[PDB]
């Protein structure tokens, strides 16, 4: 169900996203689609608290396969 | 005009009781310089038939991260929908291969994104690929048609949705093709599908070739438009391009409407490349045609526009889209207008019916006097969710179905904030007195509370 990526809104931009991966410990796989300030991370509510409580990271969610039919 | 001498375009009755893209096609238009890419399974960009009109700058692979949007080769042909798809829309013509797309003339890309893991992130990737380049995304999946399931687009994709409509296309806003799906065995609402329910996504629906509603088809109030797709076995079905370079004449359901809307938009857009995502809304509203389409709900709205649970404002019209498109003037600046009604929870027990006259934001900024969508935002919760249905009527009595029972869906989770839309009172006026139904439809002693209930009007003054 869950897999190992975590989407983050960082609004200090890429150099912010950046340093994020750093220190946290993460992997900056970069940027979402066209969401200029969204990002995914490789490294778990824990690992998904310690991005949100980032005082940089306005919100951040692990990402979970859903079932998606075909018609 | 000379029309194609493919040797499946005879095939295509639903070409030339047609969508009429013959009249699109005379009047100049058959796709040039309009991209549409397929948000699926993957394409077949080697296709004799497609790889004419392959663009990869409208494709990617976003399951093996990788350009190259192949489709996965299996013993039963699991990965032939993208292509499928593909084909109805700009298929080749005049080659001596199989039949011809919509808009013969436009590129063709497509995404690989189902046959994978699909995660909020994935779906949001593809949504937003090159917006700038792709004008048109065409997309038939969703939430599972069980009957029980209430699903939508997460916060990525739910982005992705609106950065899309605002910045896409050079701020025009990126199109957003939708199936409204395939659960009519299990008496399944498309309501409850976030996808098709959108506003921003222009949702399809399938009639049969002998314009009855199929058996796959969902009703639901967000549907806008209608093109022919599947019926039964004394029925023809769509003709199109298949895996391993082959020809079909046997492609079904609501996925193959869907491509055919986008490329008729496809044409529109040809036609007016200065179209906005809410002017080609609008366009549909206007030129499609209820005529020689059987339903057994077939209501008359505010502005006397015929309008149907199963066939939105009836069938894609090429020609009449085209036409209109020439000289349409762009609408006016999107405006929301949010009104809390609720002051209190009410408890629904067997029959729950709330009223409030509104003003449409008079005075603000947001005064709407022509509406589009309208949203009836609702939190509620209920002992069996499927026993429900509720209705919103406007001002000018139209009244709409939010949500129809669903024997299947026994769930005890109720909604929460969930927005019911409806496309039945475009170009209404919203000022006036809007009723909220909520009734029990089975025999059992059902309890619930409706929470909360925030009618959201969309429209321009
Ligand atoms: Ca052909
Ligand atoms: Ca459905
Ligand atoms: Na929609």
Not at chain 2, 93 to 118: F, P
Not at chain 2, 203 to 214: D, L, R
Not at chain 2, 267 to 275: H, I, P, V, W, Y
Request: hydrophobic share 35%; charged share 20%; with cysteine.
């Amino acid at each position: 169900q869950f897999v190992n990526e975590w989407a983050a809104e960082i609004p200090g931009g890429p150099e912010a996203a950046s340093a994020i991966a750093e220190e946290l410990g993460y992997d900056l796989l970069g940027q979402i689609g066209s969401l200029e300030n969204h990002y995914l991370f490789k490294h778990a509510f824990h690992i998904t608290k310690r991005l949100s409580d980032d005082d940089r990271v306005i919100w951040a969610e692990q990402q979970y396969e859903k079932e998606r039919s075909k018609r | 005009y000379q029309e194609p001498t493919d040797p499946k375009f005879p095939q295509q009755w639903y070409l030339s009781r047609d969508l009429n893209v013959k009249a699109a096609w005379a009047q100049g238009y058959t796709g040039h310089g309009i991209v549409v890419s397929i948000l699926d399974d993957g394409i077949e960009k080697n296709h004799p038939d497609l790889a004419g009109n392959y663009d990869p700058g409208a494709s990617f692979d976003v399951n093996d991260q990788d350009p190259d949007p192949q489709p996965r080769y299996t013993q039963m042909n699991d990965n032939r929908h993208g292509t499928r798809c593909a084909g109805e829309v700009a298929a080749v013509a005049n080659n001596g291969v199989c039949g011809v797309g919509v808009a013969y003339n436009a590129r063709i890309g497509g995404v690989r994104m189902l046959d994978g893991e699909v995660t909020d992130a994935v779906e949001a990737r593809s949504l937003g690929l090159n917006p700038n380049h792709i004008h048109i995304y065409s997309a038939s999946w969703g939430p599972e048609d069980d009957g029980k399931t209430v699903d939508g687009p997460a916060r990525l994709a739910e982005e992705a949705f609106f950065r899309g409509v605002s910045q896409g296309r050079g701020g025009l806003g990126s199109i957003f093709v939708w199936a409204s799906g395939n659960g009519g065995r299990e008496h399944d609402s498309c309501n409850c599908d976030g996808y098709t329910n959108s506003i921003y996504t222009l949702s399809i629906s399938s009639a049969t070739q002998f314009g009855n509603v199929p058996w796959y088809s969902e009703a639901c109030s967000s549907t806008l438009a209608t093109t022919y797709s599947s019926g039964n076995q004394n029925e023809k079905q769509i003709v199109t391009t298949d895996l391993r370079q082959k020809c079909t004449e046997s492609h079904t359901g609501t996925s193959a409407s869907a491509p055919l809307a986008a490329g008729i938009i496809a044409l529109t857009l040809e036609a007016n490349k200065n179209l906005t995502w809410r002017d080609m809304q609008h366009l549909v509203v206007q030129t499609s045609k209820p005529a020689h389409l059987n339903a057994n709900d077939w209501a008359t709205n505010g502005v006397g526009r015929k309008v149907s649970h199963s066939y939105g404002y009836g069938l894609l019209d090429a020609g009449a889209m085209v036409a209109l498109a020439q000289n349409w003037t762009t609408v006016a600046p999107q405006r929301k207008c949010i009104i809390d009604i609720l002051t209190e929870p009410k408890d629904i027990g067997k029959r729950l019916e709330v009223r409030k006259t509104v003003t449409a934001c008079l005075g603000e900024p947001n005064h709407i006097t022509r509406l589009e969508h309208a949203q009836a935002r609702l939190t509620l919760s209920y002992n069996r969710r499927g026993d429900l249905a509720i209705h919103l009527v406007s001002p000018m009595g139209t009244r709409s179905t939010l949500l129809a029972a669903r024997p299947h869906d026994y769930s005890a989770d109720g909604f929460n904030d969930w927005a019911f839309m409806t496309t039945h009172s475009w170009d209404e006026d919203p000022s006036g007195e809007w009723v909220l139904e909520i009734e029990n439809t089975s025999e059992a002693n059902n309890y619930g509370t409706l929470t909360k209930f925030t009618l959201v009007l969309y429209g321009t003054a």
